RNA sequence: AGGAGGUAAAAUUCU
RNA sequence: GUAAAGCGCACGCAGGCGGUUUGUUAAGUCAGAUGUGAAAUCCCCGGGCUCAACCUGGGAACUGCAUCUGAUACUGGCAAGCUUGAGUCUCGUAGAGGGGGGUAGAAUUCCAGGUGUAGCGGUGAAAUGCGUAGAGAUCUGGAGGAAUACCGGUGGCGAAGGCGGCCCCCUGGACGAAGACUGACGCUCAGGUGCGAAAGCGUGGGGAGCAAACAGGAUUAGAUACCCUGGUAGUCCACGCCGUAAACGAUGUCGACUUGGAGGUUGUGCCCUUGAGGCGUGGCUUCCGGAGCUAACGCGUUAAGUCGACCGCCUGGGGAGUAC
């Protein structure tokens with residue numbers, strides 16, 4: 215689950231202060247950040263089915279809570295995906 | 303789950319009173335209180351406390367007799383996946399009169415005994431006997 | 432209000448969970464009991480067996496298990512009633528319609544341990560005849576000469592008298608027993624916690640209920 | 650007083 | 665659960681369902697009012713053909729629809745919140761969780777020799793087979809493949825299938841503790857996606873053991889078997905198929921609620937390390953068992969007890985999980 219140090223960086227700008235660790239902005243950011251790095255892990259290995267199963271949770275959850283906010287505070291999303299990368 | 307809390311309420315007290323408990327702690331909602339009040343107003347319990355806070359906690363006491371519970375039946379009728387509403391003329395007589403049927407209405411909650419002598423209807427919530 | 436000294440509550444991790452409301456025990460694991468629950472369960476139990484001992488009532492001492500066996504064989508022979516001491520015969524009450532007719536085979540050959548023929552015939556009839564007398568007298572002083580429907584009996588250990596308590600409950604007869612920390616109360620309308628097991632402790636209840644009943648109404 | 654290892658081979662059918 | 669019936673497993677769209685407080689609307693819900701709901705028919709009370717069937721007067725009934733006006737508890741919509749369901753951060757815990765590469769040690773087989781001599785092997789008993797080029801036995805040395813004794817255990821881990829020597833790299837999940845942030849972000853899930861023992865298929869590589877097929881020895885009435893000497897596919901690796909098992913606990917997932925006893929195992933908070941503690945509190949887990957449930961067997965806080973959300977499935981044996 216990446217480094218205990220890491221994510222320290224990403225709570226800023228996304229969050230209003232450090233240890234504001236629960237804004238939906240950050241977890242999404244935490245998830246993507248892992249996922250992205252973590253796609254390297256499945257390049258090599260790749261027949262590591264089990265590890266993948268955990269991945270999709272990250273992806274499922276990410277997407278599930280990326281949909282939550284779509285209902286609350288409009289364009290509190292259109293100010294973060296492009297800020298990050300993903301709307302495919 | 304926390305999906306049908308009134309039914310969770312009626313369960314608490316059902317295998318509550320079957321288990322011969324003294325009373326039962328419970329989360330509170332502005333509804334649960336209003337149904338408790340009718341179990342008070344009809345003596346299926348002795349009385350209920352809110353034991354509140356910002357995280358309310360309505361407790362409420364037993365009520366036994368000889369050796370048994372006074373609630374010889376307490377089931378949930380209308381419910382989340384199957385809502386039930388009756389008209390005024392057509393509403394239920396639990397044990398054909400003895401024992402009640404608690405029923406919401408444009409005027410608060412209220413009982414079936416009461417439901418008619420008033421003259422209206424609504425969501426029949428549980429049958430109590 | 433101790434009255435009874437070295438006594439407390441005995442027996443260990445067996446305990447009927449539905450015997451929580453009367454027991455403030457723990458202690459090395461042998462959980463002791465609320466004693467000001469037992470003595471008001473006397474002053475109600477030891478009490479209301481004179482409302483009946485005045486009604487010309489007929490009790491029945493019940494105590495078996497090789498431990499203070501014939502401790503119950505005592506004033507019991509007097510205490511406006513009698514006892515029963517070695518193994519509970521399946522339904523002496525319950526099936527009084529018979530076994531009642533084995534008092535007969537006793538008191539017949541009892542008044543015959545001394546009266547009429549008590550030696551005349553062979554001395555091989557010698558022991559085998561008294562062997563009958565020997566085998567049931569330590570099994571039914573139980574009746575000797577009785578009279579009624581023995582209403583309310585008194586059992587030492589509640590569930591060791593497994594049978595007795597149930598048989599009584601099927602017949603409507605009262606109850607009156609003690610429960611240490613493992614026997615099922617449930618079927619004893621007059622429940623007196625304490626302890627079933629101790630030669631000392633048992634003779635206290637025995638001595639205390641032997642009193643109070645003896646004063647029927649003179 | 651525990652464990653261990655070795656002791657029966659094949660042999661159908663009944664309006 | 666065993667009678668027919670829980671998808672082998674999980675992830676998730678639609679949909680169903682949803683914590684808790686204020687307002688707000690009046691959709692659902694409830695009350696009234698008006699309209700209408702043809703007549704005949706059924707029903708109630710009458711009338712009339714000699715009675716009856718039948719005809720007939722009047723009523724009730726037509727369980728309903730629409731509109732206007734209200735009521736606003738419950739459901740829904742809109743609004744704003746709340747933190748307890750839920751997730752995020754922090755330091756750690758144990759684990760055969762998964763993937764990659766590495767290496768050890770014991771044995772079987774084989775290759776080369778040394779010594780050594782007529783037997784070895786195998787079975788119920790045999791024989792096939794192996795041995796006079798020397799077997800079996802033994803010693804030394806060297807190949808190669810597969811599997812990890814002891815730990816190991818009603819032990820752990822995984823969603824299920826399933827995972828056991830040792831070593832580092834990558835990675836998943838579970839759980840504990842304090843506090844911090846989030847503020848219902850949920851549960852379930854037809855469709856859809858993916859995972860899925862063994863045998864099996866493709867391409868090649870690999871091949872010590874084992875072993876379908878096949879062969880020879882027995883056995884037997886027969887012996888296409890069970891037993892013995894051999895033995896190929898395969899069992900091993902790589903990459904792509906296949907998608908089924910008594911894939912089982914024959915018991916769908918989530919949450920809440922109800923006496924107990926022995927444990928097993930892994931955390932952690934407090935108190936003379938004052939023990940290999942004293943006192944608690946979490947998660948998982950094995951046996952016994954109350955109430956209750958059950959057709960009975962049995963289940964029994966890890967329910968098959970008490971409830972509620974949502975899904976899947978059964979409707980007599982066959983025909984048949986067959987045909988199209």
Ligand SMILES: [Mg+2]
Nearest residue numbers: 660661662663
């Ligand atoms: Mg035969």
Ligand SMILES: [Mg+2]
Nearest residue numbers: 661662663664
């Ligand atoms: Mg034949």
Ligand SMILES: [Mg+2]
Nearest residue numbers: 666667668669
């Ligand atoms: Mg079946």
Ligand SMILES: [Mg+2]
Nearest residue numbers: 670671672916
């Ligand atoms: Mg299943």
Ligand SMILES: [Mg+2]
Nearest residue numbers: 305382682739
């Ligand atoms: Mg609701």
Ligand SMILES: [Mg+2]
Nearest residue numbers: 711712713715
């Ligand atoms: Mg007429």
Ligand SMILES: [Mg+2]
Nearest residue numbers: 702703704726
């Ligand atoms: Mg009409």
Ligand SMILES: [Mg+2]
Nearest residue numbers: 688739740741
């Ligand atoms: Mg509302």
Ligand SMILES: [Mg+2]
Nearest residue numbers: 803804805806
């Ligand atoms: Mg060698």
Ligand SMILES: [Mg+2]
Nearest residue numbers: 806807808809
């Ligand atoms: Mg080697």
Ligand SMILES: [Mg+2]
Nearest residue numbers: 215835836837
């Ligand atoms: Mg880890």
Ligand SMILES: [Mg+2]
Nearest residue numbers: 263858859860
């Ligand atoms: Mg696959």
Ligand SMILES: [Mg+2]
Nearest residue numbers: 862863864899
């Ligand atoms: Mg295979």
Ligand SMILES: [Mg+2]
Nearest residue numbers: 865866867898
């Ligand atoms: Mg192949």
Ligand SMILES: [Mg+2]
Nearest residue numbers: 671672908909
């Ligand atoms: Mg199938």
Ligand SMILES: [Mg+2]
Nearest residue numbers: 825826911912
């Ligand atoms: Mg299995």
